[PDB]
């Protein structure tokens, strides 16, 4: 590197630098997808927006390929690079909540659990993903969905402004009143337009949530999935119900004869009055025989921290995903036949139903595509042993292929390292064209290309 | 304020200053105990250790009364002052976790749920309090106990070093090998010796936790509290079992006829294998008839997020607490007599059993007193209506006095605003004297006196 350039970086940088020789280098460069093993030239742990400014500008002048890291959960491995710089936001974790204004201002490196802890100090919340240690940054920039989404929308449907550092080092505010073209693009366009150092969200009062998790035997799979698909077509916004087909975890609530066998783990909640919730959940828990039933009245923060049963983080993952407009009987039989071949205790075949308030937002209103498709299937393979990569990767590949005709589009935040080419078909032609024009305005040199990338 | 010393402050202070004419002043000056209404001259939202140094020194030079604020949970109201400065740490929220080294380094403004989210990304944890939005800062400096304490000790029992800003403006590292007199005092001595900007903890692997919560009618109070007291005297460290006497919350798992009436809310968990946990919890769940039983196998992050049933944060509080070396049958009847007179649905009469690993640490190894007293009673009054302060305060006051023959010592972190006199009783003569000598060395002018104060 150039001494003078690096020294100008060091003169403006207040964060922490991790070099390949430093003690923590090997752990700092690991991301959630362990199949991604890469060695950056430098890890820049920023602690402020001026730190990001200095890091972006240093990267530009130095020609270092830029990775940006929030929570490290990229299913494509985007938050680490070979030979470049990781602009690592993990220390920018602050959240300021106004109870009176039902507002949260959160830094671009927050984990979901930090954000939910801060809003719930005032019994407030806003939609985000279901696993606490996911990063707010990548999740929100891709759109963001979870337990609160049928009632309150995607994360981006509650976003009111961002602070963002663009490729030329400038700092912008983007909102409905200021740079609205950029504000449109960051609501679903990924890290393509710069590093978001602060997000501002509208919040909602969310008291205790009635919640249930239970497991159905695979021989009752047909009636259970068909009951789910039929019920969610007309369900009220307050009800959320998701199916996770997986090997049953060896938990005392489950009969021993089911441990390790494929099952349907059904999780549901009611966002609203808990007594109504209990009535609503009891009315959907008995499409099959509920094994291992857990019912609770939870603070929202505890609902957020619940997923997933077993509380084990896999080392290695591979995902294939898409949306469905309908879940046909043939699609259902295919889901069931492939779930019966799950071989790792960490793998799940996920069936999610969105719709509700997500679908009421006009498709043109944000960069997020596929609001009118209520079904999401995620073949989320996950395992420990690197010698088993091919066996678990094949499971997700063949399940996807056996479903592919029924699938449309794709969530950019469930893309795997090999799906750089699914970008156009994920956004659709109109959105992709609009994204490209924003990119030419704000990142014409494509300095930010470790993402589901939109070339200028 | 002399313009010179202020102008210096701003050249070195990279954080956010809030002044009394600013719109966000009223909200920024509120703390969890809403009975505390104070107007500081300045709120300084620090964002880094250099920010804290600048604020401390500015407050020293300017002669301003110093309040330090982590999570804002001081039951005595210490984290806001009239006419002084608030060194507010809430934006200093970052945590670095090493999975391999089982280490967490957390900034001094962290909330517990942010810390637990970060450690649980790796299936690790270390003891802390039971409500997610409490600050790590004030909790750890007083000792810190919760669900993991019977297995792994107080928070301070897993603390391996701090970075601290002393009253002269200096930055120090204190550990078992570097300034160990200071390290002893900060492990239980509160904010008396300076502002801790980073805490380093040893972590533990904590997988899924079998957990139960249930409610017993006061009709069965005697047999239930006696079973608890007898069982806990010889229980393994892995069992934690606490009683919360309260009005039953209006939740659907409870019969409506019980809503609003005094009950015993018993919460229990097993830190270890969940199949053993299920066997052990069933062994302690039927000393009376359990109502509204919830049993679940939870990730530790969700157990942390669970307390307390109802998910209500009160506006106004008043606490009286102490330790017990024994809970007689007589004491049990008094507790029950006073619990029957609970008025607010947010008040709890808490009966905790510590012991286990907390008691195996030698008394003199930290500044935390009363390790050998296994019982804690906390008369935790909590309510909303500011015209009702006197009736709820009286319940707590009179309940404490009626148990005065059984109660000794006191946790510094449960003291109320009028308990500045309890400090010697709490620490005991010996510990108090040693603390004064560390105080004479490190804060000889008592710049940090908004705490359970140890004069030098
Ligand atoms: C276990 C698990 C559970 C999940 N659950 C859900 C769920 O319930 N709902 C859901 O919608 N998604 C969910 N996701 C997907 C998640 O939205 C994506 O993995 C997302 O990219 C994670 O963001 P991150 O910051 O953790 O990832 P990173 O790998 O840090 O970043 C992801 C991408 O965003 C960019 N980026 C991150 N932060 C910023 C920033 N501040 N500014 C600019 N660019 C940024 C990176 O450069 C990269 O392109 C889950 C993922 C995992 C692994
Ligand atoms: C709802 C609730 C639940 C609780 N549960 C538990 C529990 O399960 N276990 C338990 O042990 N305690 C518990 N507590 C008590 C808690 O430990 C004390 O209230 C503690 O002082 C709170 O710390 P804080 O940073 O949130 O408070 P603050 O009001 O911000 O600070 C309290 C004291 O610590 C000082 N201080 C705070 N941070 C720092 C720092 N970084 N450096 C120096 N001084 C600092 C302040 O000056 C002050 O004297 C609970 C409290 C509440 C209100």
* Binding residue ranges of A: 68, 70-74, 79, 108, 130, 135, 138-139, 145, 196, 411, 413, 450
Q: Do A94 and B92 touch (CB under 8 A)?
A: yes
Q: What atom in ligand 2 is closest to the CA of residue B143?
A: 11
CATH number for the region A15-93 comes to 3.30.43.10
Neighbours of B89 (CB within 10 A): 30
Cα A134 to middle of ligand 1, angstroms: 6
Candidates A278, A311, A346, A384, partner chain B, best to mutate (most B CBs within 10 A): A311
In angstroms, what is the resolution?
1.8
Whether the domain at A15-93 and the domain at A206-415 fall into the same CATH topology: no
Q: How far is A286 from chain B (nearest CA, A)?
A: 18
Q: Which ligand is nearest to the CA of A192?
A: 1
CB B134 less than 6 A from any atom of ligand 2: yes
Contact in structure between A42 and A16 (CB atoms under 8 Å): no
Taken in order B273, B276, B279, B283, the sign of the CA dihedral is negative
Cα A413 to middle of ligand 1, angstroms: 6
Q: Do A311 and B123 touch (CB under 8 A)?
A: yes
Residues from chain A that touch B96, judged by Cβ atoms under 8 A, are 90-91
DSSP collapsed to 3 states, chain A: CCHHHHHHHHHHCCCEEECCCCCCHHHHCCCCCCCCCCCCCEEEECCCHHHHHHHHHHHHHHCCCEEEECCCCCCCCCCCCCCCEEEECCCCCCEEEECCCCEEEEECCCEHHHHHHHHHCCCEECCCCCCCCCEHHHHHHHCCCCCCHHHHCCHHHHEEEEEEECCCCCEEEEECCCCHHHHHHHCCCHHHHCEEEEEEEECEECCCEEEEEEEEEHHHHHHHHHHHHHHHHHCCCCEEEEEEEEEECCCCCCCHHHECCEEEEEEEEECCCHHHHHHHHHCCCCCCCCEEEEEEEECHHHHHHHCCCCCCCCCEEEEEEEEECCCCHHHHHHHHHHHCCCCCCCCEEEEEECCHHHHCCCHHHCCCCCCCCCEEEEEEEEECCHHHHHHHHHHHHHHHHHHHHHCECCCHHHCCCCCHHHHHHHHCHHHHHHHHHHHHHHCCCCCCCCCCCCCC
Among protein residues, the one with the nearest Cα to ligand 2's atom 49 is B451
CATH number for the region A94-205+416-443 comes to 3.30.465.10
Q: What span, in angstroms and rounded, lies between the C-alpha atoms of B284 and B278? A: 10
Residue-range domain boundaries for chain B: 15-93, 94-205+416-443, 206-415
Of B93, B207, B306, the CB nearest to A298: B306
Q: Do B117 and A121 touch (CB under 8 A)?
A: no
Q: What atom in ligand 2 is closest to the CA of residue B317?
A: 53
User: How many Å from the N-terminal Cα to the C-terminal Cα in chain B?
Assistant: 28
Closest to B127 measured CA to CA, from B204, B195, B196: B204
Q: Do A114 and B118 touch (CB under 8 A)?
A: yes
Q: Which ligand is nearest to the CA of B136?
A: 2
Burial of A414 (0-12, 13-18, 19+ CB in 10 A): buried
CB B71 less than 6 A from any atom of ligand 2: yes
Q: Do B311 and A208 touch (CB under 8 A)?
A: yes
Closest to A205 measured CA to CA, from A118, A142, A123: A123
Contact in structure between B155 and B126 (CB atoms under 8 Å): yes
Residues from chain B that touch A291, judged by Cβ atoms under 8 A, are none
Q: What span, in angstroms and rounded, lies between the C-alpha atoms of B283 and A302? A: 26
Cα B389 to middle of ligand 1, angstroms: 47
Neighbours of A80 (CB within 10 A): 24
Q: What span, in angstroms and rounded, lies between the C-alpha atoms of B132 and A51? A: 30
Q: Do B133 and A111 touch (CB under 8 A)?
A: no
Contact in structure between A67 and A82 (CB atoms under 8 Å): no
Cα B405 to middle of ligand 1, angstroms: 57
Of B93, B123, B299, the CB nearest to A305: B299
Q: Which residues pair with A296 in a beta bridge?
A: A211
Between the CA of residue B24 and those of A185, A202, B144, B155, what are the distances in Å? 31, 17, 31, 33
Burial of B234 (0-12, 13-18, 19+ CB in 10 A): exposed
Q: Do A91 and B90 touch (CB under 8 A)?
A: no
Question: Does the domain spanning B206-415 belong to CATH 3.40.462.20?
Answer: yes
Q: What span, in angstroms and rounded, lies between the C-alpha atoms of B414 and B432? A: 18
Contact in structure between B280 and B241 (CB atoms under 8 Å): no
Candidates B122, B197, B311, partner chain A, best to mutate (most A CBs within 10 A): B311
Contact in structure between B39 and B83 (CB atoms under 8 Å): yes
* Binding residue ranges of A for FAD: 68, 70-74, 79, 108, 130, 135, 138-139, 145, 196, 411, 413, 450
Residues from chain B that touch A136, judged by Cβ atoms under 8 A, are none
Between the CA of residue B211 and those of A52, A412, B147, B242, B275, what are the distances in Å? 43, 37, 11, 12, 11
Of A48, A100, A297, the CB nearest to B252: A297
> Which residues have C-beta atoms less than 6 Å from ligand 1?
A 31-32, 68-75, 78-79, 89, 108, 129-131, 134-135, 137-139, 141-142, 144-146, 190-191, 195-196, 413, 450-451
Q: Do A113 and B111 touch (CB under 8 A)?
A: no
Between the CA of residue A231 and those of A360, A369, B156, what are the distances in Å? 19, 24, 51
């Amino acid at each position: 590197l150039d001494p003078a350039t690096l020294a100008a970086f060091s003169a403006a940088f207040r964060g922490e630098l991790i070099w390949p020789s430093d003690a923590d280098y090997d752990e700092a460069r690991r991301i959630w997808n362990g199949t991604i093993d890469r060695r950056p030239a430098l890890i820049a742990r920023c602690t402020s927006t001026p730190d990001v400014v200095a890091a972006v500008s240093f990267a530009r002048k130095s020609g270092l390929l830029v990775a940006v890291r929030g929570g490290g959960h990229s299913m494509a491995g985007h938050s680490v690079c070979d030979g470049g710089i990781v602009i690592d936001l993990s220390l920018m974790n602050s959240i300021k909540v106004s109870r009176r204004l039902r507002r949260a201002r959160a830094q671009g490196g927050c984990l979901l659990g930090a954000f939910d802890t801060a809003t719930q100090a005032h019994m407030l919340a806003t939609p985000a993903g279901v696993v606490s240690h996911v990063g707010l940054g990548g999740l929100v920039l891709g759109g963001g969905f979870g337990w609160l989404s049928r009632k309150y929308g995607l994360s981006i449907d509650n976003l009111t402004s961002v602070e963002i550092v663009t490729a030329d080092g400038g700092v912008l505010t983007a909102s409905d009143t200021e740079n609205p073209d950029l504000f449109w693009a960051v609501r679903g366009g990924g890290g393509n337009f710069g590093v978001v150092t602060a997000f501002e969200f509208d919040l909602h009062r969310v008291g205790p949530v009635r919640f249930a998790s239970t497991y159905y035997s695979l021989d009752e799979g047909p009636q259970v999935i068909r009951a789910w698909r039929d019920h969610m077509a007309t369900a009220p916004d307050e009800l959320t119900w998701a199916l996770y087909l997986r090997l049953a975890p060896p938990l005392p609530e489950l009969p021993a004869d089911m441990h390790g066998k494929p099952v349907i783990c059904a999780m549901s909640c009611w966002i609203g009055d808990p007594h109504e919730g209990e009535r609503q959940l009891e009315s959907i828990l008995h499409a099959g025989k509920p094994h291992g039933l857990t019912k609770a009245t939870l603070p929202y923060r505890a609902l957020q921290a619940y997923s997933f049963p077993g509380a084990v983080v896999p080392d290695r993952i591979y995902t294939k995903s898409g949306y469905l407009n309908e879940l046909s009987d043939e699609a259902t039989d295919t889901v069931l036949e492939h779930a019966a071949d799950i071989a790792s205790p960490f793998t799940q075949l996920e069936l999610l139903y969105l719709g509700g308030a997500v679908a009421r937002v006009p498709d043109d209103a944000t960069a997020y595509p596929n609001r009118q498709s209520p079904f999401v299937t995620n073949l989320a393979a996950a395992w420990m042993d690197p010698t088993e990569d091919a066996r678990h990767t094949a499971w997700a590949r063949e399940g996807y292929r056996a479903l592919a005709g029924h699938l449309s589009g794709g969530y950019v935040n469930f893309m795997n390292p090999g799906e750089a080419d699914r970008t156009r078909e994920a956004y659709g032609a109109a959105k992709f064209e609009r994204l490209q024009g924003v990119k030419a305005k704000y990142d014409p040199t494509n300095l930010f290309r470790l993402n589901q990338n939109i070339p200028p």
